[PDB]
């Protein structure tokens, strides 16, 4: 059907924030198909070719002082500015995670109970999920599916714990997240 | 590091497709509808706390296209190499019979940014309530994309996310069913 060759051009301006507005780094990147050809790193202060293909542009743009002056001031007028515009609903967006504990629908072991700690619908993504057995943090046997970004400003993750359950034992899943002042806990009574 | 804001744009020939969007820590803040010439916020709430001059994205896209053609010529018309997407289907929360949920079709690590996605319920196309995001940037310069299907779980239904991309020899079907 359609076999014509494609040609792609991408331009990315990345503003990197450390300790909020304290330290800011601007990274301007030009990508042809899948290769970055030229970039402006505010830490360098000028355009630099990433590949042979970008040399003419790095040279040409660096000969335009107005341009460089503008790009050098962008960490303030662009990056710090946009950070201020969205901070109230980006940097400070908070959505508490829903937490539940249940046995895995799959138990591939003998006298072993694989426990699942499901943590979903939260924001931001930084989160800490840890298991405990009678107040003692479980190191080994733990396995996570990793942080899953849903594309709608929410995350989810499953953190399993293999166990050799004995009546009376209390297995706790602890969740620390910026949305709550104190850890969220869900216990499994074995 | 703590946070990253990205203004990402692209133009693709010969499809003539273009995109302009802002990203915060991997999530889309907004993109610009090139045809309606207006800002489309990822979440409705955003449009009440901030604004953006959409017509300005169009100025950039015109420069992007001009530059694409200069680069195409400068590379002796080296076309892009297709890279097929990794496709994954998941729910946005633990599934429970008869309790409303959402099927998420995650299309990741691919290029060029042109894909055809279809949801199938028992082998039949579904167009009810589905939604999708635009193409999202990746550090390796490939793309990501999300397609959504709100549904009511039941052991009676089976689903498939059908993905087509030039990097794939055949349409890819990612199946999902209760359990």
């Amino acid at each position: 059907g359609d076999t014509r060759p494609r040609f792609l051009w991408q331009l990315k301006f990345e503003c990197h924030f450390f300790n909020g507005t304290e330290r800011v780094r601007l990274l301007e990147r030009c990508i042809y198909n899948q290769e970055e050809s030229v970039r402006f790193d505010s830490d360098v202060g000028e355009y630099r070719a990433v590949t042979e293909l970008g040399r003419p542009d790095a040279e040409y743009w660096n000969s335009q002082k107005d341009l460089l002056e503008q790009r050098r001031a962008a960490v303030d007028t662009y990056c710090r500015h946009n950070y201020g515009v969205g901070e109230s609903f980006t940097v400070q967006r908070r959505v508490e995670p829903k937490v539940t504990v249940y046995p895995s629908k799959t138990q591939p072991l003998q006298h072993h109970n694989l426990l699942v700690c499901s943590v979903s619908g939260f924001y931001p993504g930084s989160i800490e999920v840890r298991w405990f057995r009678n107040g003692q943090e479980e190191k080994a046997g733990v396995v996570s599916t990793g942080l899953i970004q849903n594309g709608d400003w929410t995350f989810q993750t499953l953190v399993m714990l293999e166990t050799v359950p004995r009546s009376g034992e209390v297995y706790t899943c602890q969740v620390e997240h910026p949305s709550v002042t104190s850890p969220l806990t869900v216990e499994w009574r074995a | 590091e703590e946070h990253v804001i990205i203004q990402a744009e692209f133009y693709l020939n010969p499809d003539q497709s273009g995109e302009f969007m802002f990203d915060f820590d991997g999530d889309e803040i907004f993109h610009v509808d090139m045809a309606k010439k207006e800002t489309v916020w990822r979440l409705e709430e955003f449009g009440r706390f901030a604004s953006f001059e959409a017509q300005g994205a169009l100025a950039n896209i015109a420069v992007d296209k001009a530059n694409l053609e200069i680069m195409t010529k400068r590379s002796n018309y080296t076309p892009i190499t297709n890279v097929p997407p990794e496709v994954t289907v998941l729910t946005n929360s633990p599934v429970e019979l008869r309790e409303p949920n959402v099927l998420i079709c995650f299309i990741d690590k691919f290029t060029p940014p042109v894909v055809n996605v279809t949801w199938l319920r028992n082998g039949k196309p579904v167009t009810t309530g589905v939604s999708e995001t635009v193409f999202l940037p990746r550090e390796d310069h490939l793309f990501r994309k999300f397609h959504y299907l709100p549904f009511l779980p039941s052991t009676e239904d089976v689903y498939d996310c059908r993905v087509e991309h030039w990097g794939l020899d055949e349409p890819l079907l990612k199946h999902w069913e209760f359990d």
Partner: peptide, 13 residues
């Protein structure tokens, strides 16, 4: 608050 965009520059022809 209004987000601002960075302007794209023409490449060397």
């Amino acid at each position: 608050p209004k987000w601002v965009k960075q302007n794209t520059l023409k490449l060397a022809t």
